[PDB]
Design a protein around this ligand. Structure first.
Ligand SMILES: NS(=O)(=O)N1CCc2ccccc21
Ligand SMILES: [Zn+2]
Length: 258
């Protein structure tokens, strides 16, 4: 009886196995745009993905992960609120059954159709497993998706999903350039938070971009054909794999922009 996104094992249940679910820096949160304060001190954000090496795409039963070679400083995130260098390890998405839900963060209580998470780990801790035990171990770049025009840089991801329909399936996924998933502006909000799935560790500096990317209805419909289940099991469509907003508690959300 594992965690998931159903009535019986969904976010309102996670606290029983993972009591930090009710902790002091849980994610996601609602971003109240009128309460977020411009922080003139935030350093410029640096997204350096030119040398990124994608390797594989995996359906893990909760989402699909595009995995990178993180055995050297190829693809790194620096600057903004960050001290030091954070190495890209994977990206994934969270999405809805309908276009009116799917994001984990909200903006003035608005839900987007989906949310992209680019996961990076602080290289001063040596490996990802050590980094997640630290309060500044990870930096997650979050990007909202709205439905409208296609995102050409997403289509290579969309077209492989048929080959990883069910939990535990993977496929080779080399030479994918995650720069094609970014919006034009790097204006962001930032706050200290957590993983949004078990084990809900409080190790993340969240960096959520203000500008959403546009994807087509056909692109997101292909995300919604994935399965939570394993091969041969009763089909359970992989939809609504998002955690709702958590209490902000004793935190301030900072804006990079006026
Ligand atoms: N949104 S999420 O919590 O699933 N996420 C962000 C940080 C991280 C680390 C390892 C695996 C996944 C992720
Ligand atoms: Zn995520």
């Amino acid at each position: 009886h594992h965690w998931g996104y159903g009535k019986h094992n969904g976010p309102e249940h996670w606290h029983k196995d993972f009591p930090i679910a009710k902790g002091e820096r849980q994610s996601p949160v609602d971003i109240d745009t009128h309460t977020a304060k411009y922080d003139p001190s935030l350093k410029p954000l640096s997204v350096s993905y030119d040398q990124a090496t994608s390797l594989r795409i995996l359906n893990n039963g909760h989402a699909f992960n595009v995995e990178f070679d993180d055995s050297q400083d190829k693809a790194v995130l620096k600057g903004g609120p960050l001290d030091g260098t954070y190495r890209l390890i994977q990206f994934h998405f969270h999405w809805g059954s309908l276009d009116g839900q799917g994001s984990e963060h909200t903006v003035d209580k608005k839900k987007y159709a989906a949310e992209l998470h680019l996961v990076h780990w602080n290289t001063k801790y040596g490996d990802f497993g050590k980094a997640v035990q630290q309060p500044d171990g990870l930096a997650v770049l979050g990007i909202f998706l709205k439905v409208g025009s296609a995102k050409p840089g997403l289509q290579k991801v969309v077209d492989v999903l048929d080959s990883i329909k069910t939990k535990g399936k993977s496929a080779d996924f080399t030479n994918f350039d995650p720069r094609g998933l970014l919006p034009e502006s790097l204006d962001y909000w930032t706050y200290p938070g957590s993983l949004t799935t078990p084990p809900l560790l409080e190790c993340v500096t969240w960096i959520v971009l203000k500008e959403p990317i546009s994807v087509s209805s056909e692109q997101v419909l292909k995300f919604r054909k994935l399965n939570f289940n394993g091969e041969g099991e009763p089909e359970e469509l992989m939809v609504d794999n998002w955690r709702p907003a958590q209490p902000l508690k004793n935190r301030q959300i900072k804006a990079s922009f006026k």
